[PDB]
Amino acid sequence: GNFNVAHGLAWSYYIGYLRLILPELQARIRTYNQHYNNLLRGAVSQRLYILLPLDCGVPDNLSMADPNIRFLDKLPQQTGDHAGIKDRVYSNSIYELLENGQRAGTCVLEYATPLQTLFAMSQYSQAGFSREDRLEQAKLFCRTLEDILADAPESQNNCRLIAYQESSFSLSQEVLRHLRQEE
Amino acid sequence: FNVAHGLAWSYYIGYLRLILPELQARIRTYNQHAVSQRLYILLPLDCGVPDNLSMADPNIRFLDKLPQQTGDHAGIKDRVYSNSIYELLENGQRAGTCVLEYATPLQTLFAMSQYSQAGFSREDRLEQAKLFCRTLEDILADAPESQNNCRLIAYQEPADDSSFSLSQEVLRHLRQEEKEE
Numbered sequence A: 001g002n003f004n005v006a007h008g009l010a011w012s013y014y015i016g017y018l019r020l021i022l023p024e025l026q027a028r029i030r031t032y033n034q035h036y037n038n039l040l041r042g043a044v045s046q047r048l049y050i051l052l053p054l055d056c057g058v059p060d061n062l063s064m065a066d067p068n069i070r071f072l073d074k075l076p077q078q079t080g081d082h083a084g085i086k087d088r089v090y091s092n093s094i095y096e097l098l099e100n101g102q103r104a105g106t107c108v109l110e111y112a113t114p115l116q117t118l119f120a121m122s123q124y125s126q127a128g129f130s131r132e133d134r135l136e137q138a139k140l141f142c143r144t145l146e147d148i149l150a151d152a153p154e155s156q157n158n159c160r161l162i163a164y165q166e167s168s169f170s171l172s173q174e175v176l177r178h179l180r181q182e183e
Numbered sequence B: 001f002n003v004a005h006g007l008a009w010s011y012y013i014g015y016l017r018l019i020l021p022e023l024q025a026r027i028r029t030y031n032q033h034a035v036s037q038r039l040y041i042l043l044p045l046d047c048g049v050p051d052n053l054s055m056a057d058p059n060i061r062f063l064d065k066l067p068q069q070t071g072d073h074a075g076i077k078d079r080v081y082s083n084s085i086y087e088l089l090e091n092g093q094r095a096g097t098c099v100l101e102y103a104t105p106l107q108t109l110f111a112m113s114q115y116s117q118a119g120f121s122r123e124d125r126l127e128q129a130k131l132f133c134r135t136l137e138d139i140l141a142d143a144p145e146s147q148n149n150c151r152l153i154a155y156q157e158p159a160d161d162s163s164f165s166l167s168q169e170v171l172r173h174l175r176q177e178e179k180e181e
């Protein structure tokens, strides 16, 4: 039930996206740092940071969710032909993480989009899913994605999952704690 | 539920719900600079989805790309949605033009059945392929804003079948469409 739906979305997230952008992600980051970002303490991290809100609350604007998260730039976009669609675009955004009025981190940050589907299926009666099912599917989505990335050859320490519950919550502080943990 | 339910709702929530309300506006922009005003989505039940439509049928040739759609989605700013226009050849000459593409989650279902840690049989793939189409069809039936902007073409045909012409089937749907308008 709740397993098979989140199992398919996690594999969909990996087949259709992560396995395609992760092998060439660190080269895109290194190219951006060497040519467009000569800040000795402001280099873009070498990992794609995927936000996993366990309540599946995914806003369309990541910066307006926290005044300490500021859009900086975009990586060089990656294109390719997929399913008869010529030059399908894959673009990732670089963000500035502020703390105490200072630049504390720079990272490629985005949400796990399939969590929006779990929310919609919990919202629409035709999908026939309840809110408690959505919470269980979100946890099963994260766990399945962990099992895939732990065995995927495209994941060469270039992607970090950030799962969290749910305002006394700072999203930039959530990413900064994971950022500084690897530095 | 099962795998196809999430893939179908994702295809609607994450794609068709976003581009179909703006589809006819982009087609009018393309005419301002003879294509039907509906998105034609192929649903091969065998989940055989080639990245190049011409490899499935050489009579399907790439003509041009629609004006790109752009919007903020999830943490990705200015996510790009692009659609391609194709001409369909009949006896070496153009017989029709339309915005054509496969349903990508069907290709995802195929790749899922090939990965060991996915636990996805070949029989599971065909059943989820049918469940994907029925769920998508039922979703679009309750969303007329999106139903009249698209036409779904589900079909079951092996690659060993020289009796099937993908371009002729799309042309039949195109000609049957204009005959009802």
Ligand SMILES: [NH3+]c1ncnc2c1ncn2[C@@H]1O[C@@H]2CO[P@@](=O)(S)O[C@H]3[C@@H](F)[C@H](n4cnc5c([NH3+])ncnc54)O[C@@H]3COP(=O)(O)O[C@H]2[C@H]1F
Pocket (backbone or CB within 6 Å): A012, A013, A014, A015, A016, A017, A018, A085, A088, A089, A090, A091, A112, A113, A114, A117, B010, B011, B012, B013, B014, B015, B076, B079, B080, B081, B082, B103, B104, B105, B108
């Ligand atoms: N460029 C880019 N950026 C960020 N994230 C991505 C990404 N490409 C993939 N992903 C991630 O991987 C999931 C599965 O991708 P997939 O391809 S296997 O299935 C998709 C596809 F059939 C259709 N669709 C959505 N956008 C589409 C565009 N522009 N053109 C054609 N078809 C599209 O709708 C399904 C669900 O879209 P989703 O956003 O809810 O989930 C996506 C998303 F989370």
